[PDB]
Amino acid sequence: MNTPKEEFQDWPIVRIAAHLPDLIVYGHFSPERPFMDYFDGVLMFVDISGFTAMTEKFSSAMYMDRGAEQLVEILNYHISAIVEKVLIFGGDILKFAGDALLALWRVERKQLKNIITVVIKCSLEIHGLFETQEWEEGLDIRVKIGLAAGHISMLVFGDETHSHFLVIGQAVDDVRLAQNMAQMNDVILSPNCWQLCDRSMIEIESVPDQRAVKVNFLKPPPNFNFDEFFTKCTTFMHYYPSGEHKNLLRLACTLKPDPELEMSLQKYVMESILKQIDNKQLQGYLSELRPVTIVFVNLMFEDQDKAEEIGPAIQDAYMHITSVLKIFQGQINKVFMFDKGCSFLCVFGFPGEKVPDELTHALECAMDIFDFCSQVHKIQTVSIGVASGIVFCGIVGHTVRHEYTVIGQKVNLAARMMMYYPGIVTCDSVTYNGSNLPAYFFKELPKKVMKGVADSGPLYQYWGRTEK
Ligand SMILES: CCOC(=O)COc1cccc(C(=O)c2nonc2N)c1
């Protein structure tokens, strides 16, 4: 008998799993929402704003109407290489955003020490990818890495049709703080990461006015062999591709059809992405420079550190946010959470979802969300930033691990507005002027210098329909 080779691996379920971490793909959780679980791990936050600040230049006429296509191609070339490193070193890419990706090595508490060593080595090899790389003579193209370790909580929230997850807690807060302190080419360790790590392996230096540390060198003992050390470490890595599948970047490439599993996983993925996955839309349809309105919602909690309390609060907020977005065809593109609160990146005018009055409706949606979420138990402060303009949309990452993402100055602007103008709904000049709503519905705001934005233009508070 002949033995034709090659398992077929391109099923819809596999395509869906590309959009999700192993944390979710192999998770098998209870149906209750919210769902919380608790574990330990090492986190890596890779700041990629260096080359995703390239976006505004790809809107130039020099790119001849293929700005979006060129941008995704070059971004994916670089981001792919980072993803491959993470995956080969045993990590799980949790989410992508325009300015970062977050990766996790989940392990039993006793192995944190050795896993930190693995993650440091991975971090250094990532920097090594970019040592002599650039573009257009100028732009150097490099990254900044923060590492953290310790207790991690996971939250899954959603309804009967849509799901979202977050990791939260001090280690999560720590990784953001660490990455923020990094300069180009740095690997910064959280205080706890430094506490837990194998101090014989590395040389560090202090970070002024900070207990976090910078890794200067990974200098292992005389008879250390990283490959043998790594192999020992794989004992504790549940899904590391091995044996017959050692040639694959992800076990998830081996997923077989399973309608119950696919039902669960598809809830995390936007319907337009599922359309492409099902070969009912062209594979490049979602790469675009598109005018949109960003509504960036931040929720700050009464007790910032109590997972048992924040979980239900996020779920209650989510249920309202989704009902309000449905009414005006808005979408949640990402949910993020560090030390600054839980933020929902909402978008109006996505792929094939554009309708006029996007602006008045975006503001009215923001106010509804603001009013409702302000009365949610345990939510201390709600802040919403509204910015409108051309943004890049597309699927960013590696073939095996990628996500639909939005990138642009207006996304960053809305995100900064929600943090620098807490407790109110703010909007940019495009939104204010475009709405044609009466001027007394707004308050002209003081100009604030916000990290990452030059010339925001005049900013406004959406005060609402009444003096009240
Ligand atoms: C408004 C703050 O926006 C950002 O910081 C975006 O950058 C990222 C990039 C990757 C993951 C995350 C997360 O916050 C989480 N992903 O999963 N759990 C999280 N927490 C955030």
Curated annotation (Swiss-Prot):
<feature type="binding site">
    <location>
        <position position="406"/>
    </location>
    <ligand>
        <name>ATP</name>
    </ligand>
</feature>
<feature type="binding site">
    <location>
        <position position="47"/>
    </location>
    <ligand>
        <name>Mg(2+) 2</name>
    </ligand>
</feature>
<feature type="binding site">
    <location>
        <position position="48"/>
    </location>
    <ligand>
        <name>Mg(2+) 2</name>
    </ligand>
</feature>
<feature type="binding site">
    <location>
        <begin position="47"/>
        <end position="52"/>
    </location>
    <ligand>
        <name>ATP</name>
    </ligand>
</feature>
<feature type="binding site">
    <location>
        <position position="99"/>
    </location>
    <ligand>
        <name>Mg(2+) 2</name>
    </ligand>
</feature>
<feature type="binding site">
    <location>
        <position position="99"/>
    </location>
    <ligand>
        <name>ATP</name>
    </ligand>
</feature>
<feature type="binding site">
    <location>
        <position position="337"/>
    </location>
    <ligand>
        <name>hydrogencarbonate</name>
    </ligand>
</feature>
<feature type="domain" description="Guanylate cyclase 1">
    <location>
        <begin position="42"/>
        <end position="179"/>
    </location>
</feature>
<protein>
    <recommendedName>
        <fullName>Adenylate cyclase type 10</fullName>
    </recommendedName>
</protein>
<comment type="similarity">
    <text>Belongs to the adenylyl cyclase class-4/guanylyl cyclase family.</text>
</comment>
<feature type="binding site">
    <location>
        <position position="167"/>
    </location>
    <ligand>
        <name>hydrogencarbonate</name>
    </ligand>
</feature>
<feature type="binding site">
    <location>
        <position position="176"/>
    </location>
    <ligand>
        <name>hydrogencarbonate</name>
    </ligand>
</feature>
<feature type="binding site">
    <location>
        <position position="95"/>
    </location>
    <ligand>
        <name>hydrogencarbonate</name>
    </ligand>
</feature>
<feature type="domain" description="Guanylate cyclase 2">
    <location>
        <begin position="293"/>
        <end position="418"/>
    </location>
</feature>
<feature type="binding site">
    <location>
        <position position="99"/>
    </location>
    <ligand>
        <name>Mg(2+) 1</name>
    </ligand>
</feature>
<feature type="binding site">
    <location>
        <begin position="412"/>
        <end position="416"/>
    </location>
    <ligand>
        <name>ATP</name>
    </ligand>
</feature>
<comment type="function">
    <text>Catalyzes the formation of the signaling molecule cAMP. May function as sensor that mediates responses to changes in cellular bicarbonate and CO(2) levels. Has a critical role in mammalian spermatogenesis by producing the cAMP which regulates cAMP-responsive nuclear factors indispensable for sperm maturation in the epididymis. Induces capacitation, the maturational process that sperm undergo prior to fertilization. Involved in ciliary beat regulation.</text>
</comment>
<feature type="binding site">
    <location>
        <position position="47"/>
    </location>
    <ligand>
        <name>Mg(2+) 1</name>
    </ligand>
</feature>
<feature type="binding site">
    <location>
        <position position="144"/>
    </location>
    <ligand>
        <name>ATP</name>
    </ligand>
</feature>
